Amino acid sequence: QPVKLKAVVYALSPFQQKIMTGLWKDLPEKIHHKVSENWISATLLVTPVVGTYWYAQYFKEQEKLEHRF
Amino acid sequence: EVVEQVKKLFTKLSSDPTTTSQLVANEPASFTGSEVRMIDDDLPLAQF
């Protein structure tokens, strides 16, 4: 079923705009946004992997030293 | 007779030195590829 919309849209031709310079425009703010929104998500993905890996190396090292005469 | 009445009546004209060819030269007209879409789905016919 079609929607029934009322809007005004202005568009400029692709051959009247700069195409690539927008990739490195306000670069610091982009990084700021990415770390600000996603630091909780990155912690919930990185902490269990690194924590479990670190414990396994910690376990294997001690177990290797108890069996050593 | 038209020339004589024009000479008689059209006396108090401005005589400003501004000339149309200089006006178009300092403010030229250029074409910009672009579009405006006025979406209104209550009108019965579309016109573009």
UniProtKB/Swiss-Prot annotation, chain A:
It is found in: Mitochondrion inner membrane. The chain crosses the membrane at residues 39-55. Keywords: Electron transport, Membrane, Mitochondrion, Mitochondrion inner membrane, Respiratory chain, Transmembrane, Transmembrane helix, Transport, Ubiquinone. Residues 56-69 are mitochondrial intermembrane. The keyword Transport applies. One of its GO terms (biological process) is mitochondrial electron transport, ubiquinol to cytochrome c. GO terms for cellular component: cytosol; mitochondrial inner membrane; mitochondrion; respiratory chain complex III. Component of the ubiquinol-cytochrome c oxidoreductase, a multisubunit transmembrane complex that is part of the mitochondrial electron transport chain which drives oxidative phosphorylation. This is Cytochrome b-c1 complex subunit 8-1, mitochondrial.
Curated annotation (Swiss-Prot), chain B:
It is found in: Mitochondrion; Mitochondrion inner membrane. Belongs to the peptidase M16 family. Catalytic subunit of the essential mitochondrial processing protease (MPP), which cleaves the mitochondrial sequence off newly imported precursors proteins. Preferentially, cleaves after an arginine at position P2. Component of the ubiquinol-cytochrome c oxidoreductase, a multisubunit transmembrane complex that is part of the mitochondrial electron transport chain which drives oxidative phosphorylation. Heterodimer of an alpha subunit and a beta subunit subunits, forming the mitochondrial processing protease (MPP) in which the alpha subunit is involved in substrate recognition and binding and the beta subunit is the catalytic subunit. Component of the ubiquinol-cytochrome c oxidoreductase (cytochrome b-c1 complex, complex III, CIII), a multisubunit enzyme composed of 10 subunits. This is Probable mitochondrial-processing peptidase subunit beta, mitochondrial. The chain holds residues 291 to 338 of 531 of the full protein.
